Amino acid sequence: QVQLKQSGPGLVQPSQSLSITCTVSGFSLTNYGVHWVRQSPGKGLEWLGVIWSGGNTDYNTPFTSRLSINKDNSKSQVFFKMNSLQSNDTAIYYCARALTYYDYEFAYWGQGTLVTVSAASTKGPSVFPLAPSSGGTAALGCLVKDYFPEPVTVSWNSGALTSGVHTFPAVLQSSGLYSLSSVVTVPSSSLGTQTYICNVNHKPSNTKVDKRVEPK
Amino acid sequence: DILLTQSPVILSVSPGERVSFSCRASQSIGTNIHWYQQRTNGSPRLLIKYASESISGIPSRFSGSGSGTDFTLSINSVESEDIADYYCQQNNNWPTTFGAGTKLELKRTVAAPSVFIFPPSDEQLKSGTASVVCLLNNFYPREAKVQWKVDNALQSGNSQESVTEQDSKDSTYSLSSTLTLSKADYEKHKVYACEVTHQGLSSPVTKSFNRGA
């Protein structure tokens, strides 16, 4: 069907430029316009601009100077580029398509790209087990500690395990590095029969870790 | 630019009840308004187009009405899966603008948390830091107290809490309190306990371990 997939999340140094690629499928870029929207803590949902079927571009007023949108119809790719980023440009960026070729009712969205504007350095996380040791139900999880920037993705058993999974929001430590736990409750009788692995992925540092969690 | 004002900031209802979301415009925009849903860690989902028109795949319990400056999104019978934020968008006037959004919370019966405590792993101790974790699982309402004690010494300032958004199935919350100590400090003590206080508990619940069993 109709899909929009964006490039991975990333760190951007202050005053530097942001670059996101939207790869679409289920339709041709020559038939539909592609819009760009961001979502920030300070401004909320904000329409940035659009590239139309014929290649024309419109940019929202406060972005006309630092925004630039190009595309490759053959490769089905839209290229987003914004210059001289500051702290308040930290947001989640989306590419989106409307219901019809000329409109603005955004029926299809990309998964979003979390952009962090910071001078700090990218750092992969360390993953430690939360080993189980009430009433036939045991709890276990993974501690994902000391990474930057957000986000990190955690799944269980390659996606096969979802029931009872809680992945907590990341919290900022005094070191300026993030940390989170991801838990899951399982039958205790399965602890000897089943294997439980948290699949941790930190795209910005290309850190990819599978952590096996066993009772101590 | 058209200013879109959504009210209230937060809406709290029970399942089965009705709910209206208000979106007011700084000037007339006819019926050029669209509505969106945003679930936890998700992208916006188009609910209604042009004030009242239906969208493919959206449950019939969603509907919209209004024209001019006053618009309303409605859910005739809320389900737990409706837990999300809701935004409005105008496109009568360039550039298109969005409202600040309304949060939809669900009420439910009181549910006491299940508490679990996790000692630091031997793998972590090699780095010179100890993270003791306390898990409060599937509870309601959101308010909870976690009190850390190390050899009856009250811990303060050295813990952090994180709370999930409401679950889409049982409408509950889960909490994690993480106590962080140096390896030296952790090895210098024995009894580690977290005491949990919640409305669903008639008494504070304590989960403890002794270092190295």
């Binding site: 989640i92 979003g112 957000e150 929001p169 | -």
Partner: peptide, 12 residues
């Protein structure tokens, strides 16, 4: 009232 990048939800 503000958008939280960590959860993509409104918080305060």
């Amino acid at each position: 009232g503000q958008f939280d990048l960590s959860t993509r939800r409104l918080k305060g």
